[PDB]
Design a protein around this motif. Structure first.
Motif, PDB file in Angstrom:
ATOM      1  N   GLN A 145       0.802  -1.222   0.000  1.00 53.61           N
ATOM      2  CA  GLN A 145       0.000   0.000   0.000  1.00 53.61           C
ATOM      3  C   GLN A 145       0.842   1.284   0.000  1.00 53.61           C
ATOM      4  O   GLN A 145       1.929   1.335   0.581  1.00 53.61           O
ATOM      5  CB  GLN A 145      -0.963  -0.001   1.187  1.00 53.61           C
ATOM      6  CG  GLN A 145      -2.065  -1.029   1.087  1.00 53.61           C
ATOM      7  CD  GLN A 145      -2.748  -1.258   2.421  1.00 53.61           C
ATOM      8  OE1 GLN A 145      -2.116  -1.689   3.388  1.00 53.61           O
ATOM      9  NE2 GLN A 145      -4.042  -0.959   2.483  1.00 53.61           N
ATOM     10  N   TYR A 146       0.315   2.324  -0.640  1.00 54.26           N
ATOM     11  CA  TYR A 146       1.016   3.599  -0.774  1.00 54.26           C
ATOM     12  C   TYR A 146       1.444   4.209   0.553  1.00 54.26           C
ATOM     13  O   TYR A 146       0.707   4.147   1.534  1.00 54.26           O
ATOM     14  CB  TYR A 146       0.121   4.596  -1.504  1.00 54.26           C
ATOM     15  CG  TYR A 146       0.767   5.939  -1.764  1.00 54.26           C
ATOM     16  CD1 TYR A 146       1.711   6.090  -2.773  1.00 54.26           C
ATOM     17  CD2 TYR A 146       0.425   7.056  -1.015  1.00 54.26           C
ATOM     18  CE1 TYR A 146       2.299   7.312  -3.025  1.00 54.26           C
ATOM     19  CE2 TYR A 146       1.010   8.288  -1.265  1.00 54.26           C
ATOM     20  CZ  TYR A 146       1.946   8.406  -2.273  1.00 54.26           C
ATOM     21  OH  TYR A 146       2.535   9.620  -2.537  1.00 54.26           O
ATOM     22  N   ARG A 147       2.631   4.812   0.568  1.00 58.86           N
ATOM     23  CA  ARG A 147       3.096   5.573   1.732  1.00 58.86           C
ATOM     24  C   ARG A 147       3.790   6.859   1.312  1.00 58.86           C
ATOM     25  O   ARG A 147       4.972   6.857   0.985  1.00 58.86           O
ATOM     26  CB  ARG A 147       4.045   4.746   2.592  1.00 58.86           C
ATOM     27  CG  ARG A 147       3.635   3.312   2.670  1.00 58.86           C
ATOM     28  CD  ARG A 147       4.155   2.659   3.916  1.00 58.86           C
ATOM     29  NE  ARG A 147       3.421   1.432   4.167  1.00 58.86           N
ATOM     30  CZ  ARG A 147       3.342   0.843   5.349  1.00 58.86           C
ATOM     31  NH1 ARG A 147       3.960   1.365   6.402  1.00 58.86           N
ATOM     32  NH2 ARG A 147       2.636  -0.268   5.478  1.00 58.86           N
ATOM     33  N   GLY A 148       3.043   7.956   1.330  1.00 58.74           N
ATOM     34  CA  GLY A 148       3.590   9.246   0.977  1.00 58.74           C
ATOM     35  C   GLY A 148       4.354   9.874   2.118  1.00 58.74           C
ATOM     36  O   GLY A 148       4.214   9.482   3.276  1.00 58.74           O
ATOM     37  N   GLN A 149       5.156  10.872   1.776  1.00 54.35           N
ATOM     38  CA  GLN A 149       5.979  11.585   2.740  1.00 54.35           C
ATOM     39  C   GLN A 149       5.794  13.066   2.480  1.00 54.35           C
ATOM     40  O   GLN A 149       6.386  13.621   1.558  1.00 54.35           O
ATOM     41  CB  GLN A 149       7.451  11.194   2.546  1.00 54.35           C
ATOM     42  CG  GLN A 149       8.170  10.651   3.787  1.00 54.35           C
ATOM     43  CD  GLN A 149       8.902  11.738   4.545  1.00 54.35           C
ATOM     44  OE1 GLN A 149       8.338  12.383   5.429  1.00 54.35           O
ATOM     45  NE2 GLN A 149      10.161  11.956   4.193  1.00 54.35           N
TER      46      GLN A 149
END
Lengths: 50, 67
Positions: free
Chosen positions: A1-5
């Motif tokens: 799953q996506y993990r933005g910063q």
């Protein structure tokens, strides 16, 4: 799953560093209540040097 | 066999009783229930879609969309 910063802490840190980086602050070596005025310059010159 | 009953009842000039049509309706749903749950399945991330900095080991950049 996506993990933005998408932080916002950096800019704060960057700011703080930039402030301390423009106010150098070093040593001084004042003489002393008793000693002769030309006491420091010898040491200071040495310190400044290395 | 309940659904069978309903289908062949007209052969013998017959309307299937209520309880039967009901049980057939009910039964036919149940047959597909566990299958329907199997066929749910979420599709993968799109052709595009960034890879995400939090996700380590780049592999295929962005999203695979095929894998």
């Amino acid at each position: 799953q996506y993990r933005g910063q998408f932080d916002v802490v950096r800019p704060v840190v960057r700011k703080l560093v930039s402030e301390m980086r423009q106010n150098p602050i070093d040593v001084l070596y004042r003489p002393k209540d008793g000693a002769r005025p030309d006491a420091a310059d010898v040491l200071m010159g040495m310190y400044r040097t290395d | 066999f309940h659904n069978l009953a309903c289908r062949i009842a007209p052969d013998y000039a017959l309307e299937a009783t209520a309880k039967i049509i009901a049980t057939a309706k009910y039964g036919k749903e149940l047959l597909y229930k566990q299958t329907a749950i199997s066929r749910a399945k979420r599709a993968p991330y799109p052709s595009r879609m960034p890879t995400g900095s939090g996700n380590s080991f780049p592999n295929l950049n962005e999203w695979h969309y095929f894998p």
